[PDB]
């Protein structure tokens, strides 16, 4: 005659869908779900703010391809978590945000309930679907919907609202076991038509100057050998987007990443694989594409992404593994890309890399490192230790790290993404550490870091093998902007503080690095320790430029 | 350097996407769009209310498989039209609502502009996507995005906001030539994996009492010979939903439609093809399905529709043509459905139809026909004249017509749909007439009809071959409900009026049919005439039941 | 031990708040509420579409100053009703939209429930507040909130969602009577500060060329003697907005309505009383105000309406009765407005009225009346019969009727309003007839009429003393627009049909008027009959201009 309850049926339902981890912050009305999650034997990571719990869930979805689960409380907690859900949806990362909510009777009459919000309706602009499980019997189906909505199609955020009265509901164990079920094939393959592939095959076979653009959807797809086999069999030069670095090793001879401007302006055919033609690509128009409409081949699971920005000549709609498998067989035996195109790009790549190596070896005063020589140490380390996640965010700290730090392994580089978010660092660190079981290095702008810095304590509390490298130049872009008025600090200034001391305040290992040699030693020691560390790398306050590579996007007064 | 403007570029862009028809109502700011559309040699149907121009667009989309286009004015006009957009999206009908909108400056500051509304944001819940084209250079891409969103994936409504200032913008004709383009493959094939098909084939193969449910998604797919070859090769009994009637001829030997309750309740495997397990299927639970969980196969283009209500043993995700084509090859040579199961349902169907024949053949007083003998006439007409669109809405008027009137051809029956909308009648009539160029018969409940009845004048003004049959029983369900108080008319009562006089008021032909013989002679004459007609079929006020077949869904006071 | 239920507690609660009338359309899940409303002895008006039920509720709120109550069904019915709620909110008319909705469990998981919609969340852009009563015990409080939100502050639409499961809930009679209560003072007076009034008093006392603008909020206020006493004591010339006609008799010697352009362009101080400076006033800027910022005094209950468009020099925030009472005492004994300002305007008024009388007496062919001589008959009739509601809508039909037809009594003229809505006519007629118990005349554009025409049957079914005058010129603005192509009708054309026949089809009295004399006789006979009548006034198809007075707002192609 045994009875179960809503707490347990939700635990069983999440387990049934292969969820063993949540990230969140406890409190009414969901503390005892968090407790019982752990009692059952599943891991819960408590954070210092729900936002960073949510950035954690978001990147766990990217890495694994099953939704990261974030757990928050009502109204204020939910709001913090849904800013992260918003982010997940924008980047196409599977993520379920679960939140407690209050009394339906009181919320609907807007009477002033404890943490009152229509969280279901507030979530809607920020996810693919916003649900609410009202009754115990619908938990399994409710969770199935959330998982399918997150993983299927273009993947993304789902919000599941959990009224406080869901949890204390009861049901027989025989009924619950009756209702509990595991979805068949929640992220199905979607195969494109033969003519879609043949139209693409035609454009590529006739290309004089082809290029392949790999985006983070391609990385997410987890079909690395087959994407690489496409590149190698076709002989086509390729470029990775920010988080597509390492999908093919960044030192692959066919990479044109070190000659991007030229390669994009001069190509005729451009093969977009899991890459939107959004602002990161200047919308497929302007001088970055030579002021012309290229012949775009585009592979994407989202049908209506095609023609979003420019006319796509060969739209291939489907999942990237399926599409790429067919395109390869379609291109089988075709001649390789033009040898004087591939040669021209390689000569540019060689030359630009020789030029960068010169900057990385240059000497600077103690405590006045620049971005080249500081990050040249991380470059060298990551070439030797590739099986490590690189978390990265900032302006100059992000741009220069993407240029300098070669990724040899896929799904390791985790950065600001589609929205250029400052705030993802410490959440990404916890999640990368949790889901990989391997070391994490973070290259943080100091401003960037301030958006999630308190989570240092969380990294310490779980004893995670994470090394936070702070690029401490004392401000946003630069740390030397003049006081606008007598004794008034500039808006872009930050305290050139002892972030190493802060790390040590919570049981972490703090370092200061005033030279490339000090940073090299500290990084090697930090990673090898297998312990929470922070390296306070001292960068020249005059080293950076305004907004890094995207300076031109700034609005300036001409009066 | 000759110039063109927004008016002409929009027209060209629409034409390039194979749109040649718009349904709407003119006025500030879009009257001169409609005129210029007509001047260019395309067709504009002006209605008496935008809702009906809208329902006209939605069903044009269903029948043609390219989106119907509704044009309306700002705030109030838009609102009227958006209610129809909502319905399209709910029914998976491709549709685009183009609405003029007011001044951004003024609307954004909520200052009280002419017909002030943020129509783009207000449209959000009622459509797949809600766009705005602010600039003349973005019209080709804006129209491409609208088209692709309406017809790709699960089809549905798209709203496109056309601010007043868009139209008077100018651009060189040469630059406009450069910007105009035709989307490649806007409604692409999506093919399922081998193992998804193999799982479904193995369910069907080992089924003891299988059944195929055909929904209006299977009808919409326009792969009638694939769907029929699957039914006939597998030997599986099938059942159509309201608008799937005629996809296979309703009198097909394998149809278990006339024995639905017993087939649904007793099947072990149920193959849903373009049919949601929503309220029309009692959500796959309850007495209707014998209080058990069936083994569902389900073919649908929308991945997250699976497990929406009940677990789906074999989910096959893709477009129905692609999926059915593959499933057919997988099952090739497999035994046909159990003979004692197909024959058992056939005996049930024969005896059931023989019972209905007796009801249709029976005799009633003059001016007091029932639903059987009145609609028995329309049944006979449509069997001999199947190439005619059948528009249908009401309670008893709908339910009984669905039962009685056999459809032998696909995409002819157009009814209330997923939301059970009273109001679709006269717009459906105008669009069916315009896109098919063939006759239409409408079986309208007298209440149903009053939601769109003023559009008789539209049907007359365009001289359309539409024969509206009003089932005039004098109210909602029944026309005899007693006066609740002395000299106070009940809320369900309607004037048992001369709808024939109303039709003739606008130049149409009117009939009153008091007997089956009078209805038959009027229908044969009306349909043969090729002119706008209305038959006022006088039905017994006491012939109906509460809410028809779904009378149990009513909430009653038990005190 | 007696039990009541949700149906009855809602009836008692509405009764308790002085509601004795609803307008709507029945069907699941609210038919038996409608039935029991009547059983109890309260009136229910069933319409042919929920939209017009809602336009009825909206104008019943304006007229009475207690919210009009509209009742609809779920999803599709709600949508139709909420287009009207939207309208109520925009015009500041108190109105409660009550709608049935479906199962919370199924709607929240978006599973496909009968008429599935989050109606509560869909309503939000279109009302002041959107509530949902989930439980029987909260009905009295739920209704109290709705009534207060509708009547208090700036009055407006409220949506109350009524889940199907609300109605079948039970409670003891002693509990229900315990919970049932009548709000104290739901539309409270709001008195402005002495300095607000003194700032206004200062501007008026120093005015060389003052004008008072009366809007429909002033009419709604129901303080006619005191508003008139302000005008008369100050000697200031005044202008009424569309529905403020008759607040003071339109033939008042101080009216500058017949010299509007001059009065507005030339004034220094402008006293806005319950009138927004929205598009109806060209936003307080441009040539209609002489290209200058006037010194505006503005009385409004909505604090943040001040400075919405132009800087307001003397903002007086409060309810108009309270404000006007204080301003009068503040102006007591002050000299009257400049005699050569008042004289100059009177000379213009006299002259322009003499000019209009000349057009009203001019002869036209049979069946080719113009707007002056046709409406000059209605003018003369309304001067003799002022205690009658004039419903009015159209382009030329509205503009010319506002100019020509003098209202001597307040809250009688009911027109298209802030949004210039075509669709309000027949609903306004039913409601005006219901709440006044007196005759109604409608002056309808023929296009205008088509948006609500089927409700003719509703007017007949309740035997209402309503006379519909159709201004039948055969189209939108004009009825003579050339066929754009061979045998293709223009988009602005309408059938010059026999709307008299349509009226008679439902038991009404139909007239055709081909001359002013025929229209005069028909109108006198129609009103005096006390019965549902329609007069099909035949207007010259070439008589009207594009969009009437607001022609310049049209967007035209210059290429
Ligand atoms: C928008 C964006 C995609 C544009 O790309 P980009 O910066 O112009 O190009 P890349 O970052 O790939 O490369 C930078 C330059 O270094 C060069 N380079 C790249 N890799 C190199 C390598 N390994 N060795 C030598 N040179 C290299 C490239 O050639 C390029 O210069 P080029 O344009 O003259 O060819 C990119 O700047 C970006 O992802 N921005 C994110 C900014 C953000 O969101 N942060 C927060 C906002 S303040
Ligand atoms: C909900 C719904 C799908 C349920 O299906 P249903 O009505 O029970 O089943 P059908 O309409 O297919 O068939 C009706 C009955 O007539 C019988 N029948 C069907 N076709 C027949 C035929 N041509 N000859 C003889 N009998 C027939 C069936 O056996 C069935 O009864 P059963 O339960 O004993 O088997 C259906 O009622 C529906 O589409 N409702 C829409 C109503 C609506 O929109 N309401 C408007 C607002 S009030
Ligand atoms: C926008 C609006 C407020 C502007 O006001 P307007 O039309 O310029 O001014 P009025 O309607 O009060 O008066 C019209 C003219 O007739 C004159 N007039 C008014 N009453 C008169 C009378 N009784 N005798 C003689 N002349 C009169 C006025 O002097 C004015 O002309 P003027 O500007 O040269 O002085 C007005 O046109 C309006 O309410 N429009 C509504 C349109 C709508 O919503 N319909 C649907 C849109 S198509
Ligand atoms: N499995 C998959 N197969 C194909 N496309 C995918 C898959 N997962 C995600 N996508 C698509 O990949 C794209 C990711 O692009 P974007 O986030 O812009 O990448 P980047 O910023 O790296 O260019 C999205 O358009 C998304 O629809
Ligand atoms: N071309 C297509 N291929 C596959 N599925 C489709 C296609 N077009 C529409 N659909 C699906 O068909 C379904 C229609 O179901 P529904 O509207 O409930 O039909 P019914 O009411 O007849 O059961 C939707 O779930 C939709 O996603
Ligand atoms: N009792 C009241 N006292 C004061 N102001 C009111 C009252 N009721 C409504 N109002 C205000 O009256 C105004 C009505 O203006 P509007 O609808 O633009 O009128 P018009 O169109 O006639 O100019 C609104 O701004 C509203 O806030
Ligand atoms: C939440 C959020 N706030 C603000 C910004 C704008 N922004 C871009 S980069 C940046 C910080 C740049 O400074 P830093 O992280 O120290 O990198 P640096 O250039 O100094 O190396 C900010 C605030 C943002 N992208 N996200
Ligand atoms: C817009 C809208 N309003 C109300 C309803 C509720 N409703 C369902 S059926 C129906 C009409 C039933 O009467 P009728 O059309 O005459 O069919 P009958 O049963 O009398 O044959 C109504 C109003 C609805 N479905 N849609
Ligand atoms: C719901 C809605 N649709 C469209 C319009 C645009 N509109 C303004 S007036 C008008 C009709 C004008 O014709 P009519 O009513 O016959 O008046 P007339 O000028 O011919 O006398 C229309 C459709 C509107 N205001 N509201
Ligand atoms: Mg910095
Ligand atoms: Mg009826
Ligand atoms: Mg007209």
From Swiss-Prot, chains A, B, C:
It catalyses: oxalyl-CoA + H(+) = formyl-CoA + CO2. Changing residue 477 to F: 2-fold reduction in the affinity binding and strong reduction in the catalytic efficiency for oxalyl-CoA. GO terms for molecular function: ADP binding; identical protein binding; magnesium ion binding; oxalyl-CoA decarboxylase activity; thiamine pyrophosphate binding. It is an enzyme of class 4 (lyase). Inhibited by CoA and activated by ADP. Its cofactor is a metal cation; thiamine diphosphate. ADP binds at residues 154, 216, 276, 300, 320. Involved in the catabolism of oxalate and in the adapatation to low pH via the induction of the oxalate-dependent acid tolerance response (ATR). Essential enzyme for the bacterium survival, as it relies on oxalic acid as its sole source of energy. Catalyzes the decarboxylation of oxalyl-CoA to yield carbon dioxide and formyl-CoA. This is Oxalyl-CoA decarboxylase.
């Amino acid at each position: 005659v045994e009875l179960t309850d809503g707490f347990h049926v939700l635990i069983d339902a999440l387990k049934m869908n292969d969820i063993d981890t949540m990230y969140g912050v406890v409190g009414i009305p969901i503390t005892n779900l968090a407790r019982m999650w752990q009692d059952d034997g599943q891991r819960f990571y408590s954070f210092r703010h729900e936002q960073h719990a949510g950035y954690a869930a978001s990147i766990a979805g990217y890495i694994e391809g099953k939704p990261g689960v974030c757990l928050t409380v009502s109204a204020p907690g939910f709001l913090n978590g849904v800013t992260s859900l918003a982010h997940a949806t924008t980047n196409c990362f599977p993520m379920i945000l679960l939140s407690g909510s209050s009394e339906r009777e009181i919320v609907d009459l807007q009477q002033g309930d404890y943490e009152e919000m229509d969280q279901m309706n507030v979530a809607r602009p920020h996810c693919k679907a916003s649900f609410r499980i009202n009754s115990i019997k619908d938990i399994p189906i409710g969770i199935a919907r959330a998982v399918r909505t997150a993983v299927s199609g273009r993947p993304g955020g789902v919000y599941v609202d959990l009224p406080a009265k869901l949890f204390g509901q009861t049901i027989s164990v025989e009924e619950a076991n009756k209702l509990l079920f595991k979805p068949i094939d929640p992220a199905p393959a979607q195969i494109p038509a033969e003519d879609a592939i043949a139209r693409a095959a035609d454009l590529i076979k006739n290309a004089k100057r082809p290029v392949i653009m790999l985006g983070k959807g391609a990385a997410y797809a987890q079909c690395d050998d087959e994407i690489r086999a496409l590149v190698e069999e076709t002989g086509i030069p390729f470029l990775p987007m920010g988080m597509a670095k390492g999908l093919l090793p960044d030192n692959h001879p066919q990479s044109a990443a070190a000659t991007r401007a030229f390669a994009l302006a001069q190509c005729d055919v451009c093969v977009l694989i899991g890459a939107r033609l959004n602002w990161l690509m200047q919308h497929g128009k302007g001088k970055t594409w030579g002021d012309e409409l290229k012949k775009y081949v585009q592979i994407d699971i989202q049908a209506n992404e095609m023609d979003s920005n420019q006319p796509i000549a060969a739209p291939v709609v489907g999942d990237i593994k399926s599409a790429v498998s067919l395109l390869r067989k379609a291109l089988k035996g075709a001649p390789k890309a033009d040898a004087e195109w591939t040669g021209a790009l390689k000569a540019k790549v060689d030359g630009n890399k020789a030029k960068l190596a010169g900057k990385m070896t240059a000497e600077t005063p103690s405590g006045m490192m620049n971005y080249s020589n500081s990050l040249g140490v991380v470059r060298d380390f990551m070439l030797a230790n590739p099986d490590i996640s690189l978390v990265n965010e900032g302006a100059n700290a992000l741009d220069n790290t993407r240029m300098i730090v070669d990724m040899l392994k896929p799904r390791k580089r985790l950065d600001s993404g589609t929205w250029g978010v400052m705030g993802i660092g410490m959440g990404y660190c916890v999640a990368a550490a949790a889901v990989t079981g391997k070391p994490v290095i973070a290259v943080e702008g100091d401003s960037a870091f301030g958006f999630s810095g308190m989570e240092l304590e969380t990294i310490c509390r779980y004893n995670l093998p994470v090394t936070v490298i702070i690029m401490n130049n004392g401000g946003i872009y630069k740390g030397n902007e003049a006081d606008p008025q007598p004794g008034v600090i500039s808006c872009t200034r930050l305290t050139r503080g002892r972030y190493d001391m802060m790390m040590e305040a919570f049981g972490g290992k703090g370092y200061v690095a005033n030279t490339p040699a000090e940073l090299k030693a500290a990084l090697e020691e930090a990673v090898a320790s297998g312990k929470p560390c922070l390296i306070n790398a001292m960068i020249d306050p005059d080293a950076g430029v305004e907004s890094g590579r995207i300076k031109s996007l700034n609005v300036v007064s001409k009066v």
